[PDB]
Amino acid sequence: MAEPLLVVGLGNPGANYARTRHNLGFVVADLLAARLGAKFKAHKRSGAEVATGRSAGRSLVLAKPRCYMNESGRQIGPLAKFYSVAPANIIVIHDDLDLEFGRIRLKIGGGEGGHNGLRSVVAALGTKDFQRVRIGIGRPPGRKDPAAFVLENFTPAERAEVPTICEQAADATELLIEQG
Ligand SMILES: [Cl-]
């Protein structure tokens, strides 16, 4: 309708994190902005970078915080205000531990799944009733702490699929926006 959506892709800054598991949200957000013809630019009132557009007749504000994952939420809250976006209309794209590799799921409200970005977001919005585009990376092997697992690059085999999984992740996001 008239209410604008804020799509946020979670991730850590710096090239060396660009390919880590905890950066799929970043990649997807880039993908979307590319499809929209919109481009990112600094947002001094939130410390994040935004790109604006229109999908399925809805006004879109794409975003990628520039702080670290554990601080993601502090740039989204001020961002939600600047553009007058209710938490219900916030969509955060993210790698998901509770989902297996390549599996994509739309979801609104619920748990954080052990992801430190989401936790930061909940604590910043004072609610979990925000939308999510979950991109599965499967659970970590017993030999890796979940937090170290996501800060690592995908395996040789996995890397072959990430490109396609992101296009699919972007597609699922477009469908989510289109449905409500
Ligand atoms: Cl500004």
Establish whether 83 is an annotated binding residue. Answer: no
Residues assigned a catalytic role: 22
Give CA separation, 87 vs 6, 36, 83, 118, in Å.
Answer: 9, 23, 11, 13
Q: How many CB atoms lie within 10 A of CB 46?
A: 22
Q: Do strands 41-43 and 48-55 pair parallel, antiparallel, or not at all (unpaired)?
A: antiparallel
- Cα–Cα nearest to 41, from 6, 77, 66: 66
Please tell me the distance between residue 30's alpha carbon and the centre of ligand 1 in angstroms: 20
3-state secondary structure string across the chain: CCCCEEEEECCCCCHHHCCEHHHHHHHHHHHHHHHHCCCCEEECCCCEEEEEEEECCEEEEEEEECCCHHHCHHHHHHHHHHCCCCHHHEEEEEEECCCCCCCEEEEECCCCCCCHHHHHHHHHHCCCCCEEEEEECCCCCCCCCHHHHCCCECCHHHHCCHHHHHHHHHHHHHHHHHHC
Establish whether 16 is an annotated binding residue. Answer: no
Looking at the structure of the chain, the number of domains it has is: 1
Residue listed under structure tokens 């989902």: 99
Please tell me the distance between residue 28's alpha carbon and the centre of ligand 1 in angstroms: 24
* CATH number reported for the structural domain that contains residue 52 in this entry: 3.40.50.1470
Please tell me the distance between residue 43's alpha carbon and the centre of ligand 1 in angstroms: 5
Name the β-bridge partners of 48: 43, 65
Calculate ∠ Cα 151-23-94, nearest 5°. Answer: 110
The boundaries of the domain holding residue 152 are 1-180
Residue listed under structure tokens 């502090």: 74
Q: How was this structure determined?
A: X-ray
